[PDB]
Design a protein around this ligand. Structure first.
Ligand SMILES: [Mg+2]
Ligand SMILES: [Mg+2]
Length: 101
RNA sequence: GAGCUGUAAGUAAGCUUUGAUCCAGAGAUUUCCGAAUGGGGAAACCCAGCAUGAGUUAUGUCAUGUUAUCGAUAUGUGAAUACAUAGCAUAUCAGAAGGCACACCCGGAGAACUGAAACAUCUUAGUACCCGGAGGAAGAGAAAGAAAAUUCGAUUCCCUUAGUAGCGGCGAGCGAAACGGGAAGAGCCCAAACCAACAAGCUUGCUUGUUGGGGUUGUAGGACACUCUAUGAGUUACAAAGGACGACAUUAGACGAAUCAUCUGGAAAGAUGAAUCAAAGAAGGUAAUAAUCCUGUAGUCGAAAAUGUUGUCUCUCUUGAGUGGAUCCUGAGUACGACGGAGCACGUGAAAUUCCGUCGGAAUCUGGGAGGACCAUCUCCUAAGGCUAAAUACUCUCUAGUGACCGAUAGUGAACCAGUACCGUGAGGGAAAGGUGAAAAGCACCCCGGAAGGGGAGUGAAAUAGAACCUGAAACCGUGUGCUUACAAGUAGUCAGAGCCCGUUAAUGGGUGAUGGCGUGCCUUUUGUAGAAUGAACCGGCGAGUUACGAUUUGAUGCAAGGU
RNA sequence: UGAGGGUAGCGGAGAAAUUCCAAUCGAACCUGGAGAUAGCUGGUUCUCUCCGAAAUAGCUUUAGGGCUAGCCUCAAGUGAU
RNA sequence: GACAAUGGUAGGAGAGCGUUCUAAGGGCGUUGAAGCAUGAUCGUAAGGACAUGUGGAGCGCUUAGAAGUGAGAAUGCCGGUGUGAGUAGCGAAAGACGGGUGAGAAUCCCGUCCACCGAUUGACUAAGGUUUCCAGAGGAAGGCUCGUCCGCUCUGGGUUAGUCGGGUCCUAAGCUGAGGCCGACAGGCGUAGGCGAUGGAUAACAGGUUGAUAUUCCUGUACCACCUAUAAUCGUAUC
RNA sequence: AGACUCGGUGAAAUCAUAGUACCUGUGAAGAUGCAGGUUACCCGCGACAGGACGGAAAGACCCCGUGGAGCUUUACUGUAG
């Protein structure tokens, strides 16, 4: 449904109305990671070798039914359908009709 | 069709768009113990034999291969005893054993307390235990039958007959069947009389010994006597047993319609507004309550393959009736009777029909049996050989799905890695356990401390949710404060009431109590309890007239000489 | 007195006491029939309104139990008995 | 609106509140439900609301249905907490001091003096237990107090055989048993052969060493079984 | 040696709520709790044993149950041999 490399649009969250890209999708818990969306402030272990007494800020994963794949030819995040006469499913946006990648 | 390396968190070193992980079918590997099977044993271990093979100049040491016991086909081979037979030595042999679903079924054996208000015949009960046999079901089965009509035409299971006929220290209690309505519904193979061969008789025998042909019943049917047909008919679930070609079902899987913006919020699925799809408003999750966000549902769609169910195509195999009447056949230590027991609903009773142990013991179609002792005529039926599907009883399991069923003392003993800690020499007994948050963002850094544990700062909607982690009751232990008590005899309350400190759901209010009157706790069992008669330390959970099939009366309601 | 063994519950063993057989023996322990049976004891949970008894007779393998009669209760019927 | 009735145990009759669940109609809820806590309120009784606090997502009302439908007692059953009470105990028995160690010492380690067993409270091996043994770090629990200590927790280590005790050797009591003999089934007995040491047979002794092993490891000298080369060889020798 | 004051750890049987006096009476006939009187300021610690019908074991004796069991005989009915 949603994979890494394509834009999204958060529809339901504290950081809604924000585009971005997918970083890494947890497939079992159905959670995706988008940059700049639901960022943390981790109290890191400053006895680690890397830093000197600080607070990390890495993005936190959101569930896959909070992003929605967009093709703004009519300024709209759409849903996905599947067409194939080529031996492999080419992904189709049903609300506009164009072939996306 | 892009992330994966079981719990997996944590790092390490990697693999994958030349399709990895993950899912389904089919083949490969499957150490040692176990029926244990080369011998031994205190299971999971110890000792060997004969063949081929490595190794060493050679023994020691290793790998593969086999070798249990009965049975029954075989080949030998001397039997005590000449012939020859029980013994013995070998080749083979998907032959056998044990495990179970503690369920259902059929046989062998087979109790007790209990009910009878004691108890022995009897009932509990042919039940519980135990032992043997199997099956996907098993058992019964093709009338020596029911029955009294101008009879119908195997068995099995449900409804009714009926708690009626009966049996019963005639006590307690046990308790049918046929008729009638149904679920299901097919019937067939031998033995004998006999004809033909081959090993023993001139033998007298087609009969005996073997093997093929014949032949199956009561309206009496077959040997034998005669003609008139000889290709259509098949089953391998009964009746004899050996293959292909694609239809459909199962174990992976794919597609699958339609919502946008504001208010409160940490977050929209919510209320207020406009839109839409609907053979799809079942259900679950997503930062709260979603027909339209996700996984899906109604509907279509899909098999390289391995089983499974059937259609028709082979292919195997097969004679079908009638009339006659002379002769032969139609299951023998069988049927049945006396003595002793069992079982039929029926307890030796006048006791039929059915099987067991012991002795007696038949008739042969003008025969033999039954119709509840028995006998006589009318009536149905053919005993002493065997094999048979379905309707029926179950559930350790696999897949979809339901519930006026439970919600952590509940429902399984068990939601936690349960028949596990732990108790017992042994068989055997057997509990305790669940919840951070939407997301680990699980408390960086300073400070008292040896550390625990704290208090700030920080993440978070809230840590007064910090792994003693949701809400947090009472008992019981504390710290604070308004009234009060050190001359009094108290089931601790009640009614009358000064003085003091307060100010509610606003009504002739609340807390405290100097002094006066009355007043011997609560249940349970008793003629009668303050009782020195019984029970409870306290607080919290759990903890007892229920359901079924009948009976009778009452209330309702529908019809009413008819109801159902 | 050590070590390895044998006898088992209708039964073993007993220089004999009803003695011992896994801290129990006038007949062991464990699961099953079994939720055995009990005329005998304890227990039996919400509230108000109306009426309100008996502890006697007869028979009992009966005497602290039972059945009918007596006394209470609710509804129908005769209707001053 | 008159006149009437109304103590009550066994027991008969009537009328109601409440709890979980389902069906139908209507409704509140993150501008905060259930649950819990405080209150001076309402009804003839069981019982009903409402007002602030804590709580964080589901719950009541009207009519009818169906019950695992109501707890003060059963020497009731599981869980919690008290009174007895800071009471009875602390499990035979000789300790005293100087030094270190430590946040902390009558208790731990080292030293001197003192006492106790000495046919044993000493030294080796069977039975049984199964890591306890040993060095380095620990102080929450266990130890009848304390603890720096440990038979308790974490990490890393420890058991060497031709000759000792067993097996490749033998048989007692007993056990099992090819054929066989008996028995409703299960199964009981038993001949040849097997199994079975607490017994018979059976070739190695001193000294050294580790933080933990020693007839096992290595120092010096041995011995029994087997195999291969071998020479003096004896020959129907011999097995 | 235990007890007794101090330092360390720290149980148990028992228990309806307790601010828990005596005398002669009454009473289920033996009263801390009732009636009438008399003494009695509030709270501890060491002792003793008259009472709380003191604590522990649903009397252990004796009647009762148409309860159970073991043994016994010329009780009844059976059975191994
Ligand atoms: Mg049977
Ligand atoms: Mg008293």
């Amino acid at each position: 449904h949603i994979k890494k490399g394509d834009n999204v649009k958060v529809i339901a969250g504290k950081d809604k109305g924000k585009e971005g890209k997918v970083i890494a999708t947890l497939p079992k818990k159905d959670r995706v990671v988008v940059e700049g969306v639901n960022i943390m402030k981790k109290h890191q272990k400053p006895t680690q070798l890397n830093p000197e007494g600080g607070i990390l800020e890495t993005e936190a994963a959101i569930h896959v039914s909070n992003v929605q794949l967009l093709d703004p030819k009519t300024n709209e995040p759409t849903r996905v359908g599947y067409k194939f006469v080529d031996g492999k499913k080419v992904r189709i946006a049903k609300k506009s009709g164009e072939e996306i990648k």
